[PDB]
Paper text:
Multiple VHs and VLs were obtained, but only one VH, named 19.3H-HC, neutralized the founder Env when combined with either of two highly related VLs. The two R880F mAbs produced by combination of 19.3H-HC and 19.3H-L1 or 19.3H-L3 are hereafter referenced solely by their VL designations. To interrogate the antigen-binding site characteristics of R880F mAbs that influenced their distinct neutralization profiles, crystal structures of the 19.3H-L1 and 19.3H-L3 Fabs were determined to the resolutions of 1.7 Å and 2.7 Å, respectively. ODA analyses indicated that the antigen-binding sites of 19.3H-L1 and 19.3H-L3 were very flat, forming roughly rectangular shapes approximately 15 Å wide and 30 Å long on top of the six CDR loops.
Five total amino acid differences between the 19.3H-L1 and 19.3H-L3 VLs congregated in and around CDR1: 19.3H-L3 contained two threonines (T) and one phenylalanine (F) in CDR1 that were not present in 19.3H-L1, while arginine (R) and glutamic acid (E) residues arose just downstream of CDR1 in the FWR2 region of 19.3H-L1 that were not present in 19.3H-L3. Three CDR1 residues that differed between 19.3H-L1 and 19.3H-L3 (Ser/Thr at residue 27, Gly/Thr at residue 29, and Tyr/Phe at residue 32; Kabat numbering scheme) did not create any substantial structural differences between the two antigen-binding sites. These changes did, however, have the potential to influence antigen-antibody interactions. The Tyr in 19.3H-L1 to Phe in 19.3H-L3 change at residue 32 likely increased the hydrophobicity at the center of the antigen-binding site, which may have augmented hydrophobic interactions with the antigen. The Gly to Thr mutation at residue 29 added a polar side chain with additional hydrogen binding possibilities. Finally, the Ser to Thr substitution at residue 27 provided a more stable side chain. As a group, these VL alterations probably enhanced the antigen-binding affinity of 19.3H-L3, explaining its increased autologous neutralization breadth. 19.3H-L3 also neutralized Envs carrying the I295T substitution (0-B24 I295T and 2-B31) but displayed a much weaker level of neutralization capacity against Envs containing the I295R substitution (0-B24 I295R, 2-A9, and 2-A13). Conversely, 19.3H-L3 strongly competed with both itself and 19.3H-L1.
Numbering used by the authors:
A (entry chain H): 1 to 52, 52A, 53 to 82, 82A, 82B, 82C, 83 to 100, 100A, ...
B (entry chain L): 1 to 9, 11 to 27, 27A, 27B, 27C, 28 to 95, 95A, 96 to 106, ...
Write the structure that this text describes.
């Protein structure tokens, strides 16, 4: 079976550099071109670069040209992606992908026949930083907690120490233009309970040993 | 240099047929028969289903097929099955010797009723304002199929500065939820008469507005 295993992804500051690897087996590595394709989380695929089976010319997407450098070492069945001058918009999962057609010098005939599971690269200039928790105040009602400006992932959110589970939804985090994460957790509840029942969100941010409890109230 | 154009969302019943389109220019799709399609299930790597417009790798059901006409390539899935639910991506070889991916299409195999989103728009809390920051939170819930687009209005003018939207994921009740954030300064928040969150779902639009009162 074809195997493609990417690695090397992690956190790196804007303007910095980072080098991804892809180790391959299950086919004659030296006879095929290779590609890197990237995907910012919950967004579309974007082709990054191609290196042909034998030295000639590497091709790059306009958005990475001059900053990124693809290459390979046949002796270890490895493709590399050297990323310099990283920008925040480079945050993405990077997949390594074998080219289908044998002995091709362009990423042309056949498309990309096999892809690895990918490696995540986060471009932020930030360190361990605890969330600030703000209430989202409310026959049904929506109420919640805004979990703002933390790094890195993840936080976890419970309601009423776990007793409340129905109608709960913790969204996925968004990485902001500031290099920090924010998420929301929401509960839908009976309007008629707003005066009587106590709603507390429990926000756990392990990377900083921070727990925050926030009672959220009408008005 | 922008992605090939694909419909955001396409849906059909089990048993039915759907076609996704992929539209380029003479710079890629119009000139070259090297268009490939890929299937990606949530959290999984993409998997190749169609290459060179029409060809199918071994192992790929032949309910899948592809065609091209001018600047538009097409993927066709017949005898729709639950497992066909996924995102679909086209890609075309260009004149620059690059590979250009389309924007992707969410393909839903319909297993529950169409549901319009409920939208709740939260103004910044008072506490956040005390911290010199202001975030409008737009909570979008209970929709099916799971694809929306969100637009923000300041008073009556469009705004896309400091917007951050998550992509729909499943809720506990098996429908979809999404969220969008508008970050701005307390000055901005207090200056305008109102702000509005606009959610578009299956050609329909629902709007919520908040005012500093």
């Amino acid at each position: 079976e074809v195997q493609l295993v990417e690695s090397g992804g992690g956190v790196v500051q804007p303007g910095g550099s980072l080098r991804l690897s892809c180790v391959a087996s299950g086919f004659s590595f030296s006879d095929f071109g290779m590609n890197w394709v990237r995907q910012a989380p919950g967004k579309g695929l974007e082709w990054v670069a191609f290196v042909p089976f034998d030295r000639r010319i590497n091709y790059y997407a306009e958005s990475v040209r001059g900053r990124f450098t693809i290459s390979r070492d046949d002796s270890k069945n490895t493709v590399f992606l050297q990323m310099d001058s990283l920008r925040p918009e480079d945050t993405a999962i990077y997949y390594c992908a074998k080219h289908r057609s044998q002995w091709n010098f362009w990423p042309r005939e056949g498309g990309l026949d096999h892809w690895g599971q990918g490696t995540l690269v986060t471009v932020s200039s930030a360190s361990t930083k605890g969330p600030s928790v703000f209430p989202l105040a409310p026959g049904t009602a929506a109420l919640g907690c805004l979990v703002k400006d933390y790094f890195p992932e993840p936080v976890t959110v419970s309601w009423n120490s776990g007793a409340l589970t129905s109608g709960v939804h913790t969204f996925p985090a968004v990485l902001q233009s500031s290099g920090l994460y924010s998420l929301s957790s929401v509960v839908t509840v009976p309007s008629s309970s707003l005066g009587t029942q106590t709603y507390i969100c429990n926000v756990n941010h392990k990377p900083s040993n921070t727990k925050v409890d926030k009672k959220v109230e009408p008005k | 240099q922008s992605a090939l154009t694909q419909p955001a969302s396409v849906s059909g019943s089990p048993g039915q047929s759907i076609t996704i389109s992929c539209t380029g220019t003479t710079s890629d799709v119009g000139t070259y028969n090297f268009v490939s399609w890929y299937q990606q299930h949530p959290g999984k790597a993409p998997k190749a289903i169609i290459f060179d417009v029409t060809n199918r790798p071994s192992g790929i059901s032949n309910r899948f097929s592809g065609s091209k006409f001018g600047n538009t390539a097409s993927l066709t899935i017949s005898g729709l099955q639950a497992e066909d639910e996924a995102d679909y991506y086209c890609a075309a070889y260009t004149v620059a010797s690059t590979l250009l991916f389309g924007g992707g299409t969410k393909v839903t195999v319909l297993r529950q009723p169409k549901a319009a989103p409920s939208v709740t728009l939260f103004p910044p809390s008072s506490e956040e304002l005390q911290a010199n920051k202001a975030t409008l939170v737009c909570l979008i819930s209970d929709f099916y199929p799971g694809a929306v687009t969100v637009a923000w209005k300041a008073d009556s003018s469009p705004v896309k500065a400091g917007v951050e939207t998550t992509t729909p994921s499943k809720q506990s009740n098996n429908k979809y939820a999404a969220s969008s954030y508008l970050s701005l300064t307390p000055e901005q928040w207090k200056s305008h008469r109102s702000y509005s969150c606009q959610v578009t779902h299956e050609g329909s639009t629902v709007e919520k507005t908040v005012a500093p009162t």
